[PDB]
Amino acid sequence: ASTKGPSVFPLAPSSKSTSGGTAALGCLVKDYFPEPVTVSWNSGALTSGVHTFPAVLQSSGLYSLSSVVTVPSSSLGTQTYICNVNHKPSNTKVDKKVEPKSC
Amino acid sequence: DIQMTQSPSSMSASVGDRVTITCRASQDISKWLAWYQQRPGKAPKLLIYAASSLQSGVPSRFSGSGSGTDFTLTISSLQPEDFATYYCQQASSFPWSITFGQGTRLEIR
Amino acid sequence: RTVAAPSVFIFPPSDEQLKSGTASVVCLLNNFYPREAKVQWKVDNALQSGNSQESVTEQDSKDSTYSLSSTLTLSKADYEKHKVYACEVTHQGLSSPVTKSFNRGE
Amino acid sequence: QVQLVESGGGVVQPGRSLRLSCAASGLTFSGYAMHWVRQAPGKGLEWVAVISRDARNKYYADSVKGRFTISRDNSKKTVYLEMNSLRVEDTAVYYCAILIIPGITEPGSPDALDIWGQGTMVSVSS
Amino acid sequence: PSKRSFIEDLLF
């Protein structure tokens, strides 16, 4: 179904968080075919708290995936978080940096 | 279309507990039932055949029983490696068909 | 395993996705037990059906917990005709359905 | 040891055809029958077809009858599966396996060999 | 021949 590299979108945390607590951030790996896809964070340095979800087949025939990591709230505007998305069937390399956003 | 009714569909137990998985055939398959183990992302592993025999290497805590239509796989005190999905197969109709159960997911409590 | 309540987060659609005409809202249920859980999507306090998909992780080898993601997919046009996007989560470890939400444009 | 490896998996449009191969090593390929078993994502196992050691008797599942053909070549230790008129529901992980036959007792039997390949993914999509 | 190879011929 038209082998396609993933479109990686930032699942940004809020500039509020739990103040002095725990926040969540991640990447949205959407609209790719075929399986599989590999996701790593900070080139493999960040492995604790990482949950890469199994893919889901959409009505489009394209798969979608999300990888999330929980980080302390203080390390939001200072620590750098990049997700490295691997889709070998399309020979695709994507490295997206998730930054916090407020609205 | 020989059918194998596995139960339960899912199971929860703690390390050291004792669990029982049952398989039900739609016709007399004699003693030709086998039990398989599959871990996520891996190929199935044969554990028990002839409904009571242990494949070379499987520990003693894996035991099976039954003849005819009702069969029971019983695991003694559990280990972390034992928490996976299990299936039952039949080989009575070996040349023209082999059928499997729906599977039982053993989740660690 | 010890009954553990999920940590629930809601992620609004990214601007890079919105410029492409698609809006995906992700609800994250992190590190809960038991595996059974219920996620309900509410747009402008209206219940949603047929527009969401869910993914469940395998049991973790260390904390023996589960994680779940629920993605609500909309069009950019339909997304912009609404304000309140909410995620109602019901689980054994919670006293009441926990709701995480945000207001589009606020 | 004994190893079965599957190759030729990938993507294929509905209605078109696709051929699978499985190379065996570590034992007498002519001394055992071969099976194909698939597993749809999140579903259970489903036996597909079997070839005898003499490559004369063939049996297929009712769902794949009239669409699937199974062959083998003992000189290359390889078993083949030519799948035709494929449908979306055929999307699964196809395991090339050597299954346990009845009539075998005595738990530690060397004739109770039952091992599986790692499997290959076939995606029927358009 | 070997046992396993033998029962296979009969069943087929």
Numbering used by the authors:
A (entry chain E): 114 to 216
B (entry chain D): 1 to 109
C (entry chain F): 108 to 213
D (entry chain C): 1 to 126
E (entry chain I): 812 to 823
Can you provide the manuscript's text about this entry?
We use an epitope-agnostic approach to identify six monoclonal antibodies that bind to spike proteins from all seven human-infecting coronaviruses. All six antibodies target the conserved fusion peptide region adjacent to the S2' cleavage site. All six mAbs bound to peptides 42-44, which share the 815RSFIEDLLF823 motif. This motif is located within the SARS-CoV-2 fusion peptide region, directly C-terminal to the S2' cleavage site.
Similarly, critical residues for the binding of COV44-79 were E819, D820 and F823, but also included R815 at the S2' cleavage site. D820 and L822 are completely conserved, while R815, E819 and F823 are conserved in 34 out of 35 coronaviruses. For COV44-79, the results closely matched the peptide alanine scan, with the same four amino acids, R815, E819, D820 and F823, identified as the most critical. The fusion peptide did not form as many interactions with COV44-79 and COV91-27. However, R815, E819, and D820 contributed H-bonds and salt bridges, and I818, L822, and F823 made hydrophobic interactions. COV44-79 limited disease caused by SARS-CoV-2 in a Syrian hamster model. Furthermore, semiquantitative scoring revealed that hamsters treated with COV44-79 had less interstitial pneumonia than untreated hamsters on day 7 (P < 0.05). However, as previously reported for at least one anti-stem helix mAb, COV44-79 performed better in the hamster model than expected, suggesting that it may function in a way that is not captured effectively in the neutralization assay.
